[PDB]
Predict the structure.
Amino acid sequence: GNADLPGTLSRRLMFFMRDIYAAYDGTVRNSFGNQLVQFTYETDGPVEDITGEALGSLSACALSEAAYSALDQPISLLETSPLLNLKNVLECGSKKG
Amino acid sequence: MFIKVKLPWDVTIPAEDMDTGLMLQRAIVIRLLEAFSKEKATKDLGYLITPTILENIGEGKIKEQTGEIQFPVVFNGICFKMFKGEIVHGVVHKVHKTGVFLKSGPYEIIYLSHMKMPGYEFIPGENPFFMNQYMSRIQIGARVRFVVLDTEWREAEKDFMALASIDGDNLGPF
Amino acid sequence: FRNTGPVHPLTRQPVADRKRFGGIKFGEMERDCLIAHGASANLHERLFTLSDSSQMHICRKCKTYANGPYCRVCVSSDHVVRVYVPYGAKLLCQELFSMGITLNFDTKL
Amino acid sequence: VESTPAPFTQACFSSPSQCFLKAAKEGVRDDLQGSIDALAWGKVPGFGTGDQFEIII
Amino acid sequence: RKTSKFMTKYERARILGTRALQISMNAPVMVELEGETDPLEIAMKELRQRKIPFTIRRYLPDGSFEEWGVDELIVE
Amino acid sequence: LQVPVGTLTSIGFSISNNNDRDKMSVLEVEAPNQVTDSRLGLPNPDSVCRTCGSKDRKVCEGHFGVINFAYSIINPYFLKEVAALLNKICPGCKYICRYCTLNTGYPLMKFRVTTKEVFRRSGIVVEVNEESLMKLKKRGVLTLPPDYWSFLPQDSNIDESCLKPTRRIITHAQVYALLLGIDQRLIKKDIPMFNSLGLTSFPVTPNGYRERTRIYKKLVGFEGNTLELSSRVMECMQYSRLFSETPKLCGLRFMKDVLLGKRSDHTFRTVVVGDPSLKLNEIGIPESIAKRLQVSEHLIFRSLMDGDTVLMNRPPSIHQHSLIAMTVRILPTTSVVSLNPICCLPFRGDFDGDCLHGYVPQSIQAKVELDELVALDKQLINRQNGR
Amino acid sequence: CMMDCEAFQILDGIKGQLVGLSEDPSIKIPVSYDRALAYVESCVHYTNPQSVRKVLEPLKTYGISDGEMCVIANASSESVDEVLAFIPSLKTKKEVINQPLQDALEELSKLKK
Amino acid sequence: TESGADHSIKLKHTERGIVQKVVLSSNDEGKNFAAVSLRQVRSPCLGDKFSSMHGQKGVLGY
DNA sequence: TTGTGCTTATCGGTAGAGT
RNA sequence: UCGAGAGGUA
DNA sequence: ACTCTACCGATAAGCACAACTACCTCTCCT
Ligand SMILES: [Mg+2]
Ligand SMILES: [Zn+2]
Ligand SMILES: [Zn+2]
Ligand SMILES: [Zn+2]
């Protein structure tokens, strides 16, 4: 159990964050229609030379690595595992009822 | 109908010779020279021999295909359209019992059928066939004018073959 | 290991038999990691060049697929372009036409 | 909401048949703006490499 | 204008790859290389000597593009 | 001959009509025994193609053929839209009349699509509203008026008769009759693809591409009862690979295994062991495997040797640092690859039976970009936490 | 717009430039040169400026389309009954009298010695 | 076959060894069965995996 | 085995509209 | 060889 | 004062996908 959940979460998050990239003007724009995600990168420095890097892809990869590492953690009753907690945090629109 | 109509091209240049910035135009002209020489054919345009005037050239776009760079260049050249309703002369090459050969230069081969000239009879008493029944002798080397008909073309060779008719006036050599 | 070997009948891709020359799957996670790194030439080569590579002919006067290529929607057209797409794209187009979907392609050159 | 039709990526996510049927019924036009759509048709995504072009002249 | 004026890693890699591809196809080298048998090394030498005649067209998201040059850009 | 090469963009989607289907079809015969003809597909037992030259199933593409139908059939994809439109407009008045006023005793009717519940046919069935019928029963009206169904034209094909009077199945011919007299603007608003309503043909899949053949042959010759023809068309359309279900390659899995996940050439997979002698950026490659592995170098294939770069990965790739470009280092050992034990952390694996499969870049550009972005020295800083 | 004269003059420039640096690293085509040598020997003129001006002069003062003026220059008729029988588009018209046409033919014969 | 066709079974890429015995047998239906056994001595190589009696598992590093 | 939509069906339910 | 069901590897 | 419809909010009732990646053998048929 819980061996497929990190993979599915990583796939969905990658599908959501793949198109995000940094533009030449300095803005963070989506590939679909050049939609503005962030006017400026909200990193606390220290180098702004990253122009062609895909910020969304690396963010999704980092979150996927965090999710896969949580698979080694156990579960405590009246509580949920860090993997399930991360899944619940990432899934906000689903829990509308 | 020999109107000098401009026609752009997208000739590519191999990466074997990319140098001599002070005289790179020599590589440009030799690249387009081998471009239309390789084709040396057309469907409804005609033929071209020399790039007289080069109008304008474009930016060289490169591609990752065996080191080839394309160049968009537009220029005008000499062509000829075989429009219907034109009197064009030609030189006879040989003669036979059917399909009389007529060459308007080596660019095309024109064939003449039986139902194109007036009432004549074949003369087999000599080596070359003659049509002197209507008081006109036609041989090889004499220029004879005729009316051009619709031109045909092939798939691979795409030769500008057409039909020759002597139904018009002033027939025979002049 | 593999350099060149037999391809699958349905899709022109390397087979998954180790006794035969076989092949190594380039999965979605590897593609995502390569996108994160930003290596596009490797991604293009692994998905198109060294993978199933095919060609498709599209009429430019009318957005139709032409089977030299000949377009039966119009008269014999001398302006037909060739696009290089993976064989999976052609298989998907055939499947879409079989299920009842017609695709229109507007080539840029 | 963004009025950007992406039938190919949506089909690649889940339910390809229904997504293709809805795209055909609506008559949308996929511009292949996404990275996955470009990759599926032999085109570079354009994030790191392909965002700029190289011209000799 | 309105650019970082510093060549990114991806642009540098693409330029090096294109130059190596050109050199591998028996192309003359503008820079002078002594004891070099690798096209990648010659491309690196040309990039260091900024004598490679390439122009970079950066496509802005709005649709406009700005033409730059390798000699104009500064490597790091 | 030769054709220009261009890029592909702006793909359009539309529902096939008769015109495009006939245009794409090549040599579409109407013989029941000519399903596997020599004109469409190589795998047919003829080793020849009518429209293409002799080839090894690599130079000949799959051609399409479309059979013809004696009677017209409405497109199943537009069935729901037609049923919804027919429910709104009254079928005796052609407006937005005995069916318009409640004082005439005619109960309101509702048009809907029935799926496998009555006759296993996905068609249009008109049903009288039971709530309105119950009110009429309280007034002493036990049965519907005999002229209630006078708006339906009498179908010459009167097969499948003797049905319930409250619910009737509308044939394809009657659908067009009810659509006649309706404003074209209203019809076009609900259905954008007005030209696709008529489905008089169905294509046949190429032999080289693909129970589907049996159903296609069963449709070559058909009798009346066009509802059965529509059911057959629906059944044979659902055998497409894009529809979910057992081949196991269908639906989302078809996409994953045909476009998303692919297998490539010039790849090797072997078990990995530890070798502290090797440098961090060097990978140990056995001399036996490297001799058979061929690379493409411009002077045409040469064997693998020292200095070449190979992209190494450990499946699954959880983070971007799993892909590392490592220089090939030939070792006397065989049937194994040697890796520095320090480099285990990026791969997240240990030397206990893990297999690292590498990728050999053939193009020079891929090799150049491999050691400039995916090299170990390029990935010194972790992109997750900055350490 | 080249009928006989300026098409021949540009060929002379090709011949003049062909003798210089005849060795070419690339390939050559002999079919194109054959098409020029064996077609230009049909009809020739004396001078370029005077002939062109006298040909384009009726094109200005009289109404003739570009296609009709090109085909009549290549045919080079010498009478009034010949032109009325060649081109069917010139039949049943009264826009131009035949006497000015006869004068035009005299000018064409005058420029050709 | 009697016409010269060869429906023979060959050894694949990774198949090798020394033939040990050949067994020929047939069933009551009349179908003939043939079995050929290939043997090869295996020595511990590098990638070989070894395990202990207490769950300790690893490969032969050197 | 469910999680999540997803789409009708179905129960009043009262708001206007009218007399 | 094309498939299905099992048993295992990280 | 006193009565009919009609779009509209909250519970049943069926569909409809999807439950991880890369791997490797063995029997069964197809
Ligand atoms: Mg382990
Ligand atoms: Zn067409
Ligand atoms: Zn064929
Ligand atoms: Zn009505």
